[PDB]
Chain A
Amino acid sequence: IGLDQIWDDLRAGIQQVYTRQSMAKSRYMELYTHVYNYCTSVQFVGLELYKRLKEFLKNYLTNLLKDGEDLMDESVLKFYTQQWEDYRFSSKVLNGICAYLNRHWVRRECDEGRKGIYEIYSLALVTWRDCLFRPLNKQVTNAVLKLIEKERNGETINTRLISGVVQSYVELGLNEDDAPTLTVYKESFESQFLADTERFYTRESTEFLQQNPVTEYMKKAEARLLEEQRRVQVYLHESTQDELARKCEQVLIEKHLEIFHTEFQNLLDADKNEDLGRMYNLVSRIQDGLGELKKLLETHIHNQGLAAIEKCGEAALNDPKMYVQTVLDVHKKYNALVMSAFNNDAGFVAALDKACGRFINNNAVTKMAQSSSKSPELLARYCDSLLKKSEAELEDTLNQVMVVFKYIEDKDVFQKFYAKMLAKRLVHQNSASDDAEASMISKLKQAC
């Protein structure tokens, strides 16, 4: 067989798999036969072949770094990506040419008690951290960041280069010793990509929200948040969507949540509704602070409740219908607002019923008459004036009576007055569609 005559034709096809030159199938078998013959002979000459292959791989990359260690951005990125697919695929013919040096000697060399003996492909990947870990580690990461920093205007970011860079960084995870592999991706690219993202978005938020109103920033923030999700899924590795998104909200809207409540009140004074929906959508992504712009609405609805009843005038004391209609419209407008804008959220509806019960009971008229029981009396007079001799409307109208009935908080006056007028109605037979009264009793039974 021999041991040294082979290492003059071997290291002529080992140098031919590299510098890809379209090998035939009669030369692959010759190299495999050389490796097999060396491996089976009588004691496989120790570990000579492994050491020679290690030295060849270490010398091949040392001379390869001489041309490319002085390349700047967009040129070192085109030198890494091209001379990484030429090395990953080339060190796979070498992983099945030296297949006999992987089945018997490597599985038996290791697994007895030994470290530092890897398979040929894993050895080549380990040795590739003799070119990445000198420049490259930070000569192309800076180039990738500079290319990414074309979110401003620059299109055609050349997705292929960055994709190849991240694929190489992910594949280079620690295969040494032991037996995902995101141990280099995080410490070499992701740690200095987020810190660049905050730097970029702490300089655009403080520069856009100084010449444009808060509304335009609200629309730009949604677009930027959506854009920093399609930038992922193209240079992805996954494992970064649930981390970049979190550190893209704390800089856009978690620290600008000072002039948002002021703008919230300004839009609440007006009739802007899609703007409030965008505000709620942006704030809802951030916990611990959705509830601050929930008391402002609760106060605004209460003020609007006390505003229409003061604009009601002096007739509200003797006009139950108008008094009920005022609070009904006030409830309807903001109930529609809550259902449409704030996604029918339980907290916002709850804020709606904690202010409706505070301008129905102790608002004006109930102060003019020096009694908070003037509201149940007016509702009792209204339901009588509607359900009295004078059909679909006489159902939704009683439902609109029911919705304001829930906020009275004192029913003794209502029951007393309603019975007082119902007795007079029934005795004199001043009732129309007695089934309406039956439905009224059923509705009250369903309620308290």
Chain B
Amino acid sequence: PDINQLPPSILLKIFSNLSLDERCLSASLVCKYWRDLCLDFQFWKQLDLSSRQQVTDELLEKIASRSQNIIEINISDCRSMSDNGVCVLAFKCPGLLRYTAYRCKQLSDTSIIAVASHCPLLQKVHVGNQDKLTDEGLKQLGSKCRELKDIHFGQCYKISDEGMIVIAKGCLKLQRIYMQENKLVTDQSVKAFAEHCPELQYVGFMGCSVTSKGVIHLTKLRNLSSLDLRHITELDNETVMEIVKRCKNLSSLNLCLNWIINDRCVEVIAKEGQNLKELYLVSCKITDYALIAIGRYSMTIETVDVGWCKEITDQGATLIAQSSKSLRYLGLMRCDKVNEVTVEQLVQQYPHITFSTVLQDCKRTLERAYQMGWT
């Protein structure tokens, strides 16, 4: 019985089932053969060094010197490195594909500049709450890397339409766009991201400064799959009709916190929606009849989360359950005039539907079935 007689591929597969901490502190201290096996290049190029606050000092140069061709990095929630710990890494790693630096406020534009100028092939840039990033670093990102397929610029209150236009001019192969509540972004960018990007599948403009005049410029994308138009300046109502009716590929509709949206929109969405699978309704003025339309005039649906709506009473949730041919989620979530007695028997009568209600805290206070040790 000798594990070292096994082929090196077998040992590499065995070691791939151990995490980094047990691979650099346990397997590397057994014998030189295991150390040389754990220093292979496949175990690297997927660094994923997130949540390592007091770990990643000026050390990424050591990781990049001894291990090249890194194709994916994850330095999210980082707090130790300076800018010149990323600016050098791109200088030594010409094959990044999935850069991700969420919530690392210590960086600035120069990191993005260096990444764009040293990585001609890149497919994913996701930078989150990183307020310092300006359009000057985005201009070089949209003018030197025409290969990005997914972007994320959430919560950066310095990005305007000026750099967004530069990004949209190139990067024709864009598939997903996500955009959080950042001002200086208006319909001028939405009007250009539908003419110069016909391969868009995910679009999100939560909390932006867009209007229905630019939102209506979305029917030109025939490959639209999900929408995240939550809490926008103005949406009107016919834009919803002419967006859902034309794009017959929508699977998610997250129109949220939009006060002027009414019941007729939900009814016509149910009538027309064929590929719809995720409807997100919160705090909208719909009164006990949108649920009936969803359950009666729609064939494909699984989740409805009507919540914090000042007019949602019983006989609407109890009717959609018996009317809908498919329903896997009927979240109520602070619908005050729903009797807890109603959905205690309604829950047991329809086990295939799970409900989200303020009283449904026992579902959380059931994860104690694995630890307990409290009371």
Q: Do chains A and B touch in the complex (CB under 8 A)?
A: yes
Which A residues lie within 8 Å of B9 (CB)?
Answer: 104
- The docked-state distance in angstroms from the alpha carbon of A62 to that of B68 is 41
Which A residues lie within 8 Å of B7 (CB)?
Answer: 40
In the assembled complex, A396 has its CB within 8 A of some CB on chain B: no
Query: Which of B9, B41, B68, B69 has the largest count of A CB atoms less than 10 A from its CB?
Result: B9
Q: What does the 1/0 interface line of B34-51 toward A look like (CB < 8 Å)?
A: 000000010000000000
In the assembled complex, A8 has its CB within 8 A of some CB on chain B: no
Q: What does the 1/0 interface line of A91-126 toward B look like (CB < 8 Å)?
A: 000000000000010000000110000000000000
Q: What does the 1/0 interface line of B65-82 toward A look like (CB < 8 Å)?
A: 000110000000000000
A40 to chain B, nearest CB (A): 5
- The docked-state distance in angstroms from the alpha carbon of A324 to that of B145 is 75
With an 8 Å Cβ cutoff, the count of chain B residues facing the other chain is: 5
- The docked-state distance in angstroms from the alpha carbon of A242 to that of B133 is 49
B5 to chain A, nearest CB (A): 8
Which B residues lie within 8 Å of A104 (CB)?
Answer: 9
Interface SS of B by simple majority: loop
A326 to chain B, nearest CB (A): 53
Chain B residues numbered 2-34 whose CB sits less than 8 Å from any CB in chain A: 7, 9
Which B residues lie within 8 Å of A112 (CB)?
Answer: 41, 69
B44 to chain A, nearest CB (A): 12
Chain A residues numbered 394-441 whose CB sits less than 8 Å from any CB in chain B: none
- The docked-state distance in angstroms from the alpha carbon of A40 to that of B5 is 10
- The docked-state distance in angstroms from the alpha carbon of A104 to that of B69 is 19
- The docked-state distance in angstroms from the alpha carbon of A208 to that of B105 is 80
Which A residues lie within 8 Å of B41 (CB)?
Answer: 112
Which A residues lie within 8 Å of B68 (CB)?
Answer: 113
- The docked-state distance in angstroms from the alpha carbon of A40 to that of B7 is 6
B166 to chain A, nearest CB (A): 30
B12 to chain A, nearest CB (A): 9
B41's nearest neighbour on chain A, judged by CB, is: A112
- The docked-state distance in angstroms from the alpha carbon of A214 to that of B345 is 86
- The docked-state distance in angstroms from the alpha carbon of A112 to that of B45 is 11
- The docked-state distance in angstroms from the alpha carbon of A104 to that of B9 is 7
Chain B residues numbered 64-105 whose CB sits less than 8 Å from any CB in chain A: 68-69
B4's nearest neighbour on chain A, judged by CB, is: A42
B68's nearest neighbour on chain A, judged by CB, is: A113
A117 to chain B, nearest CB (A): 16
Q: What does the 1/0 interface line of B202-244 toward A look like (CB < 8 Å)?
A: 0000000000000000000000000000000000000000000
A219 to chain B, nearest CB (A): 43
- The docked-state distance in angstroms from the alpha carbon of A112 to that of B42 is 9
Chain B residues numbered 270-299 whose CB sits less than 8 Å from any CB in chain A: none
B9's nearest neighbour on chain A, judged by CB, is: A104
- The docked-state distance in angstroms from the alpha carbon of A112 to that of B9 is 15
- The docked-state distance in angstroms from the alpha carbon of A113 to that of B69 is 8
A115 to chain B, nearest CB (A): 14
B96 to chain A, nearest CB (A): 15
A164 to chain B, nearest CB (A): 37
A125 to chain B, nearest CB (A): 27
A104's nearest neighbour on chain B, judged by CB, is: B9
A47 to chain B, nearest CB (A): 16
B9 to chain A, nearest CB (A): 5
- The docked-state distance in angstroms from the alpha carbon of A113 to that of B41 is 11
Which A residues lie within 8 Å of B69 (CB)?
Answer: 112-113
B6's nearest neighbour on chain A, judged by CB, is: A40
- The docked-state distance in angstroms from the alpha carbon of A113 to that of B95 is 11
B10's nearest neighbour on chain A, judged by CB, is: A40
A103's nearest neighbour on chain B, judged by CB, is: B9
Chain A residues numbered 329-343 whose CB sits less than 8 Å from any CB in chain B: none
A112's nearest neighbour on chain B, judged by CB, is: B41
B157 to chain A, nearest CB (A): 40
- The docked-state distance in angstroms from the alpha carbon of A113 to that of B68 is 10
Q: What does the 1/0 interface line of A43-61 toward B look like (CB < 8 Å)?
A: 0000000000000000000
A250 to chain B, nearest CB (A): 31
- The docked-state distance in angstroms from the alpha carbon of A113 to that of B70 is 12
Which B residues lie within 8 Å of A40 (CB)?
Answer: 7
- The docked-state distance in angstroms from the alpha carbon of A408 to that of B27 is 101
B134 to chain A, nearest CB (A): 35
B40 to chain A, nearest CB (A): 10
B60 to chain A, nearest CB (A): 20
B48 to chain A, nearest CB (A): 19
B289 to chain A, nearest CB (A): 44
A113's nearest neighbour on chain B, judged by CB, is: B69
A41's nearest neighbour on chain B, judged by CB, is: B7
B95 to chain A, nearest CB (A): 9
A179 to chain B, nearest CB (A): 13
B7's nearest neighbour on chain A, judged by CB, is: A40
- The docked-state distance in angstroms from the alpha carbon of A40 to that of B41 is 20
A39's nearest neighbour on chain B, judged by CB, is: B7
Which B residues lie within 8 Å of A113 (CB)?
Answer: 68-69
- The docked-state distance in angstroms from the alpha carbon of A104 to that of B41 is 14
- The docked-state distance in angstroms from the alpha carbon of A376 to that of B213 is 53
- The docked-state distance in angstroms from the alpha carbon of A60 to that of B41 is 37
- The docked-state distance in angstroms from the alpha carbon of A40 to that of B68 is 27
- The docked-state distance in angstroms from the alpha carbon of A104 to that of B10 is 11
- The docked-state distance in angstroms from the alpha carbon of A40 to that of B11 is 13
- The docked-state distance in angstroms from the alpha carbon of A40 to that of B6 is 9
B154 to chain A, nearest CB (A): 32
- The docked-state distance in angstroms from the alpha carbon of A284 to that of B69 is 58
- The docked-state distance in angstroms from the alpha carbon of A417 to that of B103 is 88
A35 to chain B, nearest CB (A): 14
What are 6 A-to-B residue pairs whose CB atoms are below 8 Å?
A40-B7, A104-B9, A112-B41, A112-B69, A113-B68, A113-B69
Closest 6 CB pairs of A and B: A40-B7, A104-B9, A113-B69, A112-B41, A112-B69, A113-B68
